[PDB]
């Protein structure tokens, strides 16, 4: 129980950035030549 | 697993370019 | 049994007196808790297994 409670403790800051843009697209709508 | 995997030269765990884990389980 | 576990009879059976005992008051909303000497002595008998 201790390891998987810490798995969701690390994914809860993660999934708001992972699936934050997924729930947002449904209502917002999505060399060396430079030195020369 | 039908091969004996001892005549083989050093080790062949997975020859599919994905060997992330580096272990042989003796330590 | 109520012979060796007498000070830990009612306190060691539920989670609501485990944080909100309010007897020899221990910070009712789960704060710094203070016990006695035979209270932790009967505790060490069960933890020894």
């Amino acid at each position: 129980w201790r390891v998987w409670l810490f798995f969701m403790r690390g994914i809860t800051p993660l999934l708001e950035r992972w699936l934050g843009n997924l729930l947002a697209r449904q209502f917002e709508g999505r060399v060396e030549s430079h030195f020369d | 697993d039908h091969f004996n995997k001892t005549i083989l030269p050093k080790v062949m765990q997975v020859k599919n370019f994905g060997r992330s884990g580096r272990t042989k389980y003796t330590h | 049994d109520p012979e060796e576990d007498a000070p830990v009879l009612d306190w060691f059976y539920d989670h609501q007196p485990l944080r909100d005992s309010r007897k020899y008051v221990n910070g009712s909303t789960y704060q710094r808790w203070q016990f006695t000497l035979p209270m932790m002595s009967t505790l060490y008998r069960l933890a020894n297994q």
Binding site: - | - | Q34, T36, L37, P38
Partner: protein, 534 residues
């Protein structure tokens, strides 16, 4: 300063640095130059911290971890054995307690570190050693007893860690007196090897044994515990007629008689009925039942414990109840009577065993008072280092003299100080002060008796050297070097990885030879820099 600990903004003290510390250094009759030896882990460096907490109001004691202030090196705090002795100068009052200079030096007790003990024993006078009450004698106790008696110094045993006999063994108090008598018989039996102190037998009746507990801050010497008894409405002539609690048996019929007979079938001695019987009772009343009868025992014994101290754990409340009861370490009054023979006044055989004669020119001169000798009589025996590691500092007890800031001293070497004068390399020692465990004083003058930390006169010094004034010295015989009493049999070679850094390893081997006394870096004939070790 990530090498060793140092001062922290000039920590305060109960003793005045000018009204009490300056006057004590001038008076040679109250000096009490001591040096603790102890066993390997018998609680000697922790015991010096208990004297600091009794003198200084710096309450940083054993709440969670230990408070070892004598071990200043960072390796001594990580490994926990200590590899450097540290002199501590504090004001420890006696039972009367006006002022004592208390020139103490806590030496480590590892068996391979015997060279640091022989440097401190041949420099200081007092050899008060600590014995752990749980184990008794050890291998470090047998070597230190032969080294102290051969140097013609004093001896005073002290059974430290006395809390282990009750709180860690649960021994009965009747058998505890039989075990404590087994230590004093073995210590006096081991002291009967050098037949020169047959009249000076280590006994608690003569004020030699001084009981204490370095772990839990207690002290139960026969002079100090009697004064604590008479202070609690006793009035039974403390330290005047209370010297009969050893072997004699008290009796409630004929209460004014400490007879040697045994009236009852179960009636132990007076020590296990007036001293060890409450000491086993006071530890059991706080560690056995802290919720019931704990203020009842504190009010009966006269110990006003606050509510904040009552809300502590079982370990610091035991030390706080004992510190409020006993208080000041008055047990060293017996260590000032039976031991600590007041150097520069009663230090006549000390100069006879250190100096190589010097009759009618330096024997009567160094045995005289502090001021009127004149050529500073300096002898350093330990070379410390600063925070940078380059600039060294000397350390030694001034025998008879006072060279404060300006007067330079010809650094008399080990072999360069005979009748054939090889080299002196005189330099002005202007940064000499007195040292402490963590703090460091800043004094100008330096009379005899005190331990002076002379700076700037340590660069032409690789071992225990002497310093004298060039203002008319008659070139007397220099002091003998300190016999470590252990041959460095182990030899390990050392060479740098990059061969271009050859003088960098050569300069480091010279600086390491000045720190450790037994480290004799002998360059081999094959070019391999060898290092002899214990």
């Amino acid at each position: 300063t990530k090498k060793f600990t140092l001062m922290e903004q000039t920590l305060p003290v109960t003793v005045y640095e000018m009204d009490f510390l300056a006057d004590l250094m001038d008076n040679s009759e109250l000096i009490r130059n001591v040096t603790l030896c102890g066993h390997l882990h018998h609680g000697k460096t922790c015991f010096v911290d208990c004297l600091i907490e009794q003198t200084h109001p710096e309450i940083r004691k054993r709440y969670d971890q230990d408070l070892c202030y004598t071990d200043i090196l960072f390796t001594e705090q990580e490994r926990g054995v200590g590899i450097k002795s540290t002199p501590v100068t504090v004001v420890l009052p006696d039972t009367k307690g006006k002022s004592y200079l208390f020139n103490i030096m806590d030496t480590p007790g590892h068996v391979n570190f015997s060279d640091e003990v022989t440097a401190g024993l041949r420099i200081s006078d007092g050899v008060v050693l600590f014995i752990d009450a749980a184990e008794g004698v050890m291998l470090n106790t047998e070597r230190l007893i032969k080294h102290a008696v051969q140097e013609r110094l004093a001896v005073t045993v002290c059974i430290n860690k006395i809390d282990r006999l009750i709180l860690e063994l649960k021994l009965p108090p009747t058998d505890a007196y039989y075990k404590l008598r087994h230590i004093v018989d073995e210590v006096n039996g081991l002291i009967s090897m050098y037949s020169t102190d047959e009249n000076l037998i280590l006994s608690p009746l003569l004020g030699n044994v001084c009981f204490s507990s370095s772990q839990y801050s207690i002290c139960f010497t026969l002079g100090s515990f009697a004064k604590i008894y008479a202070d609690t409405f006793g009035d039974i002539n403390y330290q005047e007629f209370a010297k009969r609690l050893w072997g004699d048996i008290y009796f409630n019929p004929k209460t004014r008689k400490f007879t040697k007979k045994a009236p009852t079938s179960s009636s132990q001695r007076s020590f296990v009925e007036f001293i060890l019987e409450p000491l086993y009772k006071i530890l059991a009343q706080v560690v056995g039942d802290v919720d019931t009868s704990l203020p009842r025992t504190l009010d009966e014994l006269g110990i006003h414990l606050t509510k904040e101290e009552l809300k502590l754990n079982i370990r610091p409340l035991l030390r706080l109840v004992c510190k409020k009861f006993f208080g000041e370490f008055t047990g060293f009054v017996d260590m000032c009577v039976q031991h600590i023979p007041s150097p520069k006044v009663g230090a006549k055989p000390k100069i006879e065993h250190t100096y190589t004669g010097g009759v009618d020119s330096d024997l009567g001169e160094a045995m005289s008072d502090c001021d009127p000798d004149g050529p500073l009589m300096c002898h350093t025996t330990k070379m410390y280092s600063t925070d940078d590691g380059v600039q060294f500092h000397a350390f030694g007890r001034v025998l008879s003299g006072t060279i404060h800031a300006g007067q330079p001293v010809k650094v008399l070497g080990e072999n360069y100080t005979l009748e054939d004068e090889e080299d002196s390399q005189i330099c002005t020692v202007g940064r000499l002060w007195i040292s402490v465990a963590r703090y460091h004083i800043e004094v100008n003058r330096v009379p005899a008796g005190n331990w002076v930390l002379i700076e700037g006169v340590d660069q032409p010094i690789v071992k225990t050297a002497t310093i004298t004034e060039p203002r008319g010295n008659e070139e007397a015989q220099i002091f003998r070097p300190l016999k470590f009493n252990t041959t460095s049999v182990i030899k390990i070679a050392v060479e740098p990885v990059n061969p271009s850094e050859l003088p960098k390893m050569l300069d480091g081997l010279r600086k390491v030879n000045k720190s450790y006394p037994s480290l004799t870096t002998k360059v081999e004939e094959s070019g391999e820099h060898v290092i002899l070790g214990t």
